Amino acid sequence: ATMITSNQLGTITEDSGSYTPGTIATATRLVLTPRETPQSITVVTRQNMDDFGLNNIDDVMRHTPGITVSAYDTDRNNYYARGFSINNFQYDGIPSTARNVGYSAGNTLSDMAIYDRVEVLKGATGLLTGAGSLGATINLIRKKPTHEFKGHVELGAGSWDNYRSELDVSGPLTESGNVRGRAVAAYQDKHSFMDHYERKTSVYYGILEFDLNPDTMLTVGADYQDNDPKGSGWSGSFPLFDSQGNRNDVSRSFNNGAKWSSWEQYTRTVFANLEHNFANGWVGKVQLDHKINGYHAPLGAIMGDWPAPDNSAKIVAQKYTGETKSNSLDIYLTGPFQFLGREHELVVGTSASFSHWEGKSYWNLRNYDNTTDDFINWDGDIGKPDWGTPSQYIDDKTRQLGSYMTARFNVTDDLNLFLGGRVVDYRVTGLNPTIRESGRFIPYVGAVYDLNDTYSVYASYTDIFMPQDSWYRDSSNKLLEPDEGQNYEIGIKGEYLDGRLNTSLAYFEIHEENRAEEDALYNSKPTNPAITYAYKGIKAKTKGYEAEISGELAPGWQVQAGYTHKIIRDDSGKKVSTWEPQDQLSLYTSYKFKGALDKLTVGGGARWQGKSWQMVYNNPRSRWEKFSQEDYWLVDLMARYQITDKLSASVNVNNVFDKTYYTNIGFYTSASYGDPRNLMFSTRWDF
Amino acid sequence: XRXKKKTT
Ligand SMILES: *C(=O)C1CCNc2c(NC(=O)CCC(=O)O)cc3cc(O)c(O)cc3[n+]21
Asked: CB within 6 Å of ligand 1 — which residues?
């Protein structure tokens, strides 16, 4: 018929083995091609994740172009987006409130085995997502059930006793098709080059659809991922400084962690939602959502200038437990709007979210000896001390509301205007100095002009803010106004062949307001409660350019790659985010062969980042020290052979040259090495 | 940042 392989969220990727995307509504909730989208965008398709064996999300952020994957500890990584740290995840267009990573749970790792694509929206997301963070907003998208039947089961084992396996099954459940359903689940247990670390995750998910015509699908389902790591290290992989001695040298596989230390993060969620097709040529969607992010973290690790002369080092132990539920109501109407001349479109919409995070933390240990026989050569084996009584409780509930409305006017059959905004109110009624904000306006303004039938240009003023935590207060005792910012963008995009190939390069400049910087002088802290410690709020500026291609480079030649020049400093200040390389080159590509051996595909890619540095502190000598990560040229090859019409055979080797490099260097004075040469064989479906 | 208490 009208060839509906697309949808509300936008044309799917589990088909067109083309690394380039189809239509993303992730920006204005209004379906649009990339070119028709006036904000910087970069998306990892499914045929891409597949080719390179990008199993968990991390394995995507590493391969996403423009983003930098830095680490904290074994089970915690951070994503760098345009000078800032990405901290906004949007599942099927829905944001999440597992905001704080100190008590991280679920976000930094989601087995892809269930999504069709992960669309990252660079710039200022505020329009759709409420309070959030500058940089980018990740946006996973689940697998929606297939009309005709389809499914598969994949196995596969990689290095360090890395074994995994999923199973995808979808189709109709009644002749007519009034009802369609899909179920998928995967299992993965792997160790690591690092000693005693052996995490195992598992994910189940079931989604279904209920037709009735314009009484369009009352689709519903629920997913659940469970990460139970053991031997989890914490903050870095090893302490940068020994007792007082200079630097510390240690195997690529040392692990400050405790054999028993682990950071179990789990997330289960349920959604329900029915879309409706109105006759005016308009459609309105309504969705409910119940999700929960819990965390079971009984950490145990050795930290702090510790390889002491007598070869022994003390170790901090601490336990953190917590779950955090959330309900979300999001309804929206989006369709053709006649004003004059020709039809335009609006997308009136309002949302609501009721979260509730409660949790404990134990660090008032009892009857414990945290000293260790010897440092060097150690398999993080120490007693799992008895955590006394919770030493800090947590009972906070946030009620973020807000309504929005976006306009896609077109003065000319080339130039279209984007007027619109999202107002909002934030309420975090909890156990600490109650705070809330309301009536703040987040604006959305952009326009695209169609030059040749090919290239086109856009400009944009995206915005976003974030009511800050209570920790942050100023000289007096006021929580520095919310951390806000706007992304000033201008670039030109270009598509070729209905949308098989797609290019774009733009100039983005971000301006940060009230950035939370630790007040300095303030040691001679005068009486007032804000006493002890207080931060100040100073302005920051982030400017840079970005360019990346993606799509059908030839006949069956897929390629996606990008380069990004970034620089960020604070009011006539220094360079902040010195770890996120000022320049980065990402290039990934696969080619299927012609006739001769058209039963074989080959691919590979490479990333590059210029000098990376951090500013630590050598307590033992008080003298501050610099640390730089020379250069980065990482390459990885892949290959896959379709031996039978139904049954694939492939193999990826992720760090060809085995580049001994650093992933983090200035975290609480630690460091973590980099996945040395990976290797993973796989086999596709059937029997 | 975020709030509390690894060694201090
Ligand atoms: C405060 O003590 C800190 C140190 C800096 N930030 C930070 C982060 N990460 C961020 O949100 C900023 C991005 C970055 O440069 O890292 C995470 C955490 C997590 C925990 O658990 C703790 O204790 C501190 C912390 N901080």
From this structure: A 78, 85, 101-102; B 1-2, 6
| Residue where one domain finishes, among candidates A94, A109, A144 | A144
- Point out which residues pair with A120 in neighbouring strands: A42
The CATH number assigned to the domain holding A110 equals 2.170.130.10
Resolution (A): 3.6
Report which of A388, A225, A231 is spatially closest to residue A295, judged by C-alpha positions.
A225
Quote the domain boundaries for residue A119. 41-144
A174 shares its domain with A261: yes
Going by C-alpha positions, the residue among A453, A554, A545 that lies closest to residue A501 is: A554
Q: How far apart are CA B4 and CA A666, in angstroms?
A: 18
Question: Are the Cβ atoms of B2 and A101 closer than 8 angstroms?
Answer: yes
Are both A205 and A268 inside the same structural domain? yes
Q: Nearest residue CA, atom 8 of ligand 1?
A: B1
**What's the CATH code of the domain at A435?**
2.40.170.20
Residue A422 included in any domain: yes
SS3 A620: helix
Nearest to A416 by CA among A472, A457, A462: A457
Do the beta carbons of residue A176 and residue A126 sit within 8 Å?
Answer: no
For A236, left (φ over 0), alpha (ψ -120 to 50), or beta? left
Q: Are residues A59 and A150 in the same domain?
A: no
- A683, A648 contact by CB (below 8 A): yes
Determine whether the interchain pair B2/A102 forms a contact, defined as Cβ–Cβ distance below 8 Å.
yes
B8 contacts on A by Cβ (under 8 Å):
none
